[PDB]
Every structure is written in C-alpha cells, then in structure tokens.
Amino acid sequence: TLSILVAHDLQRVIGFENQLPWHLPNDLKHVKKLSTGHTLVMGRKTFESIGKPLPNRRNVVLTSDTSFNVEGVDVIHSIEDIYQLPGHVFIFGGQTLFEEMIDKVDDMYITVIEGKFRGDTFFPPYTFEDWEVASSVEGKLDEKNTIPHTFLHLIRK
Ligand SMILES: NC(=O)c1ccc[n+]([C@@H]2O[C@H](COP(=O)([O-])OP(=O)(O)OC[C@H]3O[C@@H](n4cnc5c(N)ncnc54)[C@H](OP(=O)(O)O)[C@@H]3O)[C@@H](O)[C@H]2O)c1
Ligand SMILES: COc1ccc(-c2cc3nc(N)nc(N)c3cc2C)cc1OC
Numbered sequence: 001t002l003s004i005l006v007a008h009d010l011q012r013v014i015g016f017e018n019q020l021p022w023h024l025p026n027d028l029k030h031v032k033k034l035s036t037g038h039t040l041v042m043g044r045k046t047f048e049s050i051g052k053p054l055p056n057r058r059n060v061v062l063t064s065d066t067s068f069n070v071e072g073v074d075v076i077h078s079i080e081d082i083y084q085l086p087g088h089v090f091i092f093g094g095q096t097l098f099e100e101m102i103d104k105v106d107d108m109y110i111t112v113i114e115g116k117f118r119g120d121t122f123f124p125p126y127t128f129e130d131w132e133v134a135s136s137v138e139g140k141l142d143e144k145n146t147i148p149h150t151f152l153h154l155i156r157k
Contacts, residue, residue, distance in 0.1 A: 002082070005034060005090040006098060006123055007111035007149075013119030015094060018049045021117035026145045034109055035090050041082055042092040047073070049094075060085065062097065095121040102126065107134070107155045114148035132157050 007027050008014050015021065036056045044063035053059035053072045060074045062082075068075045076082065079100055082089065090109075091101045102108075102124050108131070110123075131154035139149035 001088045001107070002101075002105045003088065003090050004098060004101060004105045004108040004110075005031065005040075005092055006108065007113055008123040009113040009115055009117050009119070011116055011119070012123040012125065013117050013121070014098070014123050015121035016117065016119050018045060021119060022113055022115070022147055024111075024113065024145055024147055024149060026139050027111045027113075027149065030109075030111060030151060035092075038088040038090060039085055040090050040092040041076070041085070041097070043094050043097045044068070046092060046094040046097070058085075060089075095123070099124050105156070107153065110152040110154065111139070112150045112152060114150065128154075130157055131155065 006014060007020065007024070009021070013021060035054070039058040039060060040054060041060045041062060044061060044065065047061045058074065059072065060076055061068065061070070062076050062079070064077060066077070091097055091105060134153040134155045137151045139145065139151060141148065
C-alpha cells in the first residue's frame with residue numbers, strides 16, 4: 001500500500017520556513033500510530049527539518065545528492081525507487097513529494113488543521129469527486145492541543 005500522510009490547513013498550507021506552521025501534539029501521536037513499524041519516504045528538505053530519522057520505522061529520503069549517506073536513513077534518487085519499497089509506504093512530504101505522488105497513491109491520511117496560517121508550501125488541490133471518505137474523525141481539543149483538526153482517511157475512487 002502506498003499512502004500519503006499530511007497535515008494541511010483550510011487553504012492547504014503545509015509549511016512555513018521549513019517547519020510546520022502549527023503546534024499540535026495530537027497530530028504527532030497520529031503520525032506515530034499510523035507509521036510506526038512501516039516506511040516513511042520524504043524529500044531532503046523535510047528530512048533536514050526533522051534532523052534525524054523518526055524512530056521505529058524505516059526512513060527513506062529522496063534526494064539528488066549522491067553524497068547523502070546518513071546513519072539510520074535509506075536514500076533513494078528517483079521517484080521510481082518508491083515502488084520497489086516493501087510493505088506499507090507513507091509519502092511523508094514535503095510539497096515536492098506530495099505534488100509528485102498525489103496521482104499515484106492508493107489513499108491519503110490527512111489531518112485537516114481547521115485554521116488559516118501563513119505558509120510558503122502547500123498541499124496540491126484535490127477534489128472529493130476523486131476521493132471517498134473512508135473515515136472522518138474530529139480531533140480532541142485540550143490545553144496542549146488548541147487548534148481544531150479533523151483526521152480524514154481518503155481512498156481513491
Ligand atoms: N504539513 C505537513 O504534512 C508536512 C509534511 C512534510 C513536510 N512539510 C513541510 O514541507 C516543506 C518542505 O517541502 P519542499 O517541497 O520545500 O521540500 P521537500 O519535498 O521536503 O524536499 C524537496 C527535495 O526533495 C528532493 N526531491 C524531491 N523529488 C525528487 C526527485 N524526483 N528526484 C530527486 N530528488 C527529489 C530534492 O532534494 P535535493 O535538492 O537534495 O536534490 C528536493 O530539493 C517544509 O515547510 C516542511 O515543514 C509539511
Ligand atoms: C515538532 O516536531 C515535528 C513537527 C511536525 C512533524 C510532522 C508532522 C506530520 N503530520 C502529518 N499529519 N503528516 C506528515 N507528513 C507530517 C510530517 C512531519 C515532518 C514532525 C515533527 O517531528 C518529527
């Protein structure tokens with residue numbers, strides 16, 4: 001299975017200055033729950049933003065840099081390499097990866113951040129004409145999680 005995993009706001013903002021624009025611990029818990037024991041494929045900028053591979057899953061980085069050889073990270077140099085990866089593969093970002101993969105993935109796990117942030121990177125437009133809502137679950141708000149959010153699982157029709 002090839003899936004997208006993304007958090008985007010009401011206007012599809014995903015990033016600002018190589019970070020996520022919002023602080024939302026519950027979204028990280030969601031990422032942990034979904035991708036632990038599986039595979040993340042991410043662009044080089046996303047990797048450098050996190051600085052180290054996420055524990056307890058295979059971290060795969062897509063880059064043209066042939067000098068890229070980082071401990072605990074597997075490197076790939078082509079989109080085509082993604083299709084050779086075993087098991088459940090999550091396309092993890094950033095903008096460039098999402099743009100390249102949205103027409104290719106089986107499904108998408110989207111955290112809709114129900115606010116409007118300043119962004120410099122975006123998830124590409126998509127329409128519910130193409131995507132069945134397998135589930136939609138409102139995130140719980142508390143002291144540590146103060147921005148409304150909804151977890152969507154969309155499956156290509
Ligand atoms: N909200 C979210 O769900 C989410 C998730 C992840 C990231 N983000 C955000 O997204 C933003 C970064 O996105 P971005 O588009 O600027 O960068 P990115 O997608 O993380 O990485 C771009 C880099 O990936 C490599 N790459 C992509 N396609 C390639 C290909 N076909 N062949 C070889 N290399 C390829 C290139 O690396 P080289 O230049 O080294 O060749 C390229 O410069 C940040 O703000 C980050 O915080 C948001
Ligand atoms: C505060 O640190 C972090 C903040 C945000 C993220 C982060 C959250 C994410 N959330 C979702 N739904 N999807 C992604 N593809 C995603 C990617 C990253 C990189 C990851 C972080 O650390 C690994």
